[PDB]
Design a protein around this ligand. Sequence first.
Ligand SMILES: *[C@@H]1O[C@H](CO)[C@@H](O[C@@H]2O[C@H](CO)[C@@H](O[C@@H]3O[C@H](CO[C@H]4O[C@H](CO)[C@@H](O)[C@H](O[C@H]5O[C@H](CO)[C@@H](O)[C@H](O)[C@@H]5O[C@H]5O[C@H](CO)[C@@H](O)[C@H](O)[C@@H]5O)[C@@H]4O)[C@@H](O)[C@H](O[C@H]4O[C@H](CO)[C@@H](O)[C@H](O)[C@@H]4O[C@H]4O[C@H](CO)[C@@H](O)[C@H](O)[C@@H]4O)[C@@H]3O)[C@H](O)[C@H]2NC(C)=O)[C@H](O)[C@H]1NC(C)=O
Ligand code: Y0K
Ligand code: CA
Ligand code: CL
Ligand code: NA
Ligand code: NA
Ligand code: ZN
Length: 805
Amino acid sequence: WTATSGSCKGRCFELQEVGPPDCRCDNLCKSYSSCCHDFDELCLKTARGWECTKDRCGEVRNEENACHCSEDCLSRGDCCTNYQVVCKGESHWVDDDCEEIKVPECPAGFVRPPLIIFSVDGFRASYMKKGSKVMPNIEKLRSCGTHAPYMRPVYPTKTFPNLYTLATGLYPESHGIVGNSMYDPVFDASFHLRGREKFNHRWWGGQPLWITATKQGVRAGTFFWSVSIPHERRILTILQWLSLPDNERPSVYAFYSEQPDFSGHKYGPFGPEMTNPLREIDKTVGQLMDGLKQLRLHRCVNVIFVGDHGMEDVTCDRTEFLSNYLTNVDDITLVPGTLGRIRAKSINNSKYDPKTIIAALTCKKPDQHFKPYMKQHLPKRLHYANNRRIEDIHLLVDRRWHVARKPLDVYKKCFFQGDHGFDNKVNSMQTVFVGYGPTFKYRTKVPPFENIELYNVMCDLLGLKPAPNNGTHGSLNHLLRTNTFRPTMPDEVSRPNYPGIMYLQSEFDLGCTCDDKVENKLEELNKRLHTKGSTKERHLLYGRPAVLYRTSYDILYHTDFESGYSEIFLMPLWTSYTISKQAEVSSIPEHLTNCVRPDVRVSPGFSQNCLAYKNDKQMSYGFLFPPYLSSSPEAKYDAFLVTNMVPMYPAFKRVWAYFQRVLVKKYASERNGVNVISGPIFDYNYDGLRDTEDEIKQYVEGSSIPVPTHYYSIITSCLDFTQPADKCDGPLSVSSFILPHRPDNDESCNSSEDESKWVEELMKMHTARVRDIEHLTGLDFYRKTSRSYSEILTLKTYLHTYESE
Ligand SMILES: *[C@@H]1O[C@H](CO)[C@@H](O[C@@H]2O[C@H](CO)[C@@H](O[C@@H]3O[C@H](CO[C@H]4O[C@H](CO)[C@@H](O)[C@H](O[C@H]5O[C@H](CO)[C@@H](O)[C@H](O)[C@@H]5O[C@H]5O[C@H](CO)[C@@H](O)[C@H](O)[C@@H]5O)[C@@H]4O)[C@@H](O)[C@H](O[C@H]4O[C@H](CO)[C@@H](O)[C@H](O)[C@@H]4O[C@H]4O[C@H](CO)[C@@H](O)[C@H](O)[C@@H]4O)[C@@H]3O)[C@H](O)[C@H]2NC(C)=O)[C@H](O)[C@H]1NC(C)=O
Ligand SMILES: NS(=O)(=O)c1ccc(C(=O)N2C[C@H]3CN(C(=O)c4cnc(OC5CCOCC5)c(C5CC5)c4)C[C@@H]3C2)nc1
Ligand SMILES: [Ca+2]
Ligand SMILES: [Cl-]
Ligand code: NA
Ligand code: NA
Ligand SMILES: [Zn+2]
């Protein structure tokens, strides 16, 4: 109930929202049917349009007009944005040659440059190039400021998840807005686009920028506009706020555009109808810039032009129907469209089984256009599992397609020609970033980066300390002229032991056997120095990783590789080796097929044993440093040490073997040598963070050997590939992966073919950032290079996407 009987005189677009049932005059009041009776009349004036004309110049102030061309307008701060151009001989901002803004040029009384965030829904990254002829203001911002060729959204590439990620620096799984549509089982409530429940505060986790600003004494402009308030009025309101007295004037502002997303749904991303919305957005940017110029704020304000997701071609006829796969279709609820989320229609139904549902949806038709997953098996790069609002069963849908429950859903609701929501690595989902102003660089292109990084940067632009978030603070220092954030390396928590030869062969009772026999003073000092760390500079290129938690581990040196061996997990945490362009692949000799050798530096009690793998009918084992890449027949024995051994399902050995035998040598040829760091990951509670011992759900039968949920590899070389990995003078180049450790290859529909038909495709799907790996293992890589830390942070957030240009 609102007593909508008060008045909005002298209150239009008030900065604080008043408590019901007193009526409101803020920019959100319409969305709450709570505006005072006179709001439209006083606050939404439209008389005479949005632009001065020759004859309106000098006019007597008529307070009914939408904007003014009278003499006093400037001091009042309510001119039409084109006033000085029409009435005073001035040029449009877009017609001026750009000039570097070396320092803020701001009116007296401004304590910091203000920030304006200009958000555009569905602005696909390729519109910057393809629509450049019709967006002159946006192109001037792009080419004079700092820009990226595209910005990566979060999954799912929907509007609410992405806008709230921009505001908080958080993955959807952490901020809580995990879709445009949600069911929260703890609240027993639903969140929908239409309706009231989305206004409830309990949905919205983390700490968004406007709250971070307020708590630290920076005034924020009311960010959100009711949909019916036209774009022109939003611009004018912002310009008016910028004219307020210093003690009332906000330091940060938000403008949101429903376009081009709205049109893109109807017409497809490149429909000929798509030109006009793009023209209209550019005109709005022009109005803001002409407006700032009138107030002499155009070399004072930082402007961020940013999108939430792109847009792809999608029509009704490209729909897969769960009713063509499942007998029991009325027993399930589906969240449909460009992603699938399935749960039970009724929790009283004890005959609902996720396993049988997954099985009925797995590889059933030759060209099937979705793939079912348990959420914990989704690629780790999506970070889409650790939230009770995300259903256990998920369908990743092919780009260009939709999934629905029954044909009736589609034709009882072809309408649309564009949609979005797909995997965030898809090219058509990519969006835009441009930063322009005194704190940004001048005419600079930066490489693509993820939208989770911007919250940190907007805090920096405003002198705020960011709430804890998923950005890597400092990884975007290269966008900024000043205000950079200079972080320090995390301190190592555990130092390693360096064990020598301390045990005799006969003390091991592990049930392991090896055919090693036969043999000398030359090559005996030679093998001992290898075990003392003589080739370590060849294989440990960037320092050893630091262990950022309390644990007990050893450094182990060998001719071909170095490792950090965990006495708690009974296996390496990391194994590091270098494969040069010329290195040769050999094979495992026959006398060594089932060879496993005790490691005389590590006690029996801290070792794996072969008997457990024998007894475990499902589990087998593999090696972290691959025997195929040993540098000599004598070095090959090192690769069979029990301390190089890890648990592997036979199904996963098909993947691992192909990676080690074929792919490592391939990358070494293509990249001029590579450095590889490999190891296990344990994430049983699927939160994207390293498990402690008491979190491990599975061990090799009868033993304390814990089973990894994933295996990672970090493959590094020289960005200038004319130099070999081990003698690089400049920037590095990285790609990495987190492969799920699974007892079957159900994820790959073609896995009964040769590994050369499906393995590399699986790895690409599970591409990762070094930073994803750090979270999952508690390690910190690249501790000793010649590069600056900021540059290393950038490299650690890099993702190799394998999309085309
Ligand atoms: C991305 O960045 C984010 C932000 O940095 C990272 O997430 C953080 O991870 C921290 C470590 O897991 C976590 O710290 C915990 O805080 C608990 C208190 O949490 C409240 O306070 C914070 C801060 O104000 C607040 O933001 C939280 O809000 C969450 O919960 C509500 C839902 O009710 C949501 O509105 C909100 O969106 C958010 O949800 C998300 O987080 C929770 C986890 O907290 C998830 O479960 C959700 O799915 C969702 O993702 C909270 O209001 C604190 O209680 C924890 O302490 C426990 O564990 C420690 C270990 O040190 C132990 O010492 C304690 O005893 C305690 O255990 C007790 O509780 C157990 C569980 O009930 C119980 O079993 C035990 O026996 C004990 O009794 C913990 O310190 C921090 O909250 C989140 N922050 C956010 C915003 O998510 C994230 O890790 C990053 N991701 C990656 C990949 O790096
Ligand atoms: N495109 S789609 O997914 O089909 C789809 C679905 C619903 C809608 C829709 O009705 N709408 C109506 C729109 C009103 N709106 C907003 O006011 C808002 C504007 N800024 C925002 O973020 C910040 C602003 C500051 O800097 C960083 C980003 C947010 C955040 C969620 C809180 C919210 C966004 C709503 C989606 N639009 C598109
Ligand atoms: Ca975990
Ligand atoms: Cl959704
Ligand atoms: Na076995
Ligand atoms: Na398969
Ligand atoms: Zn949309």
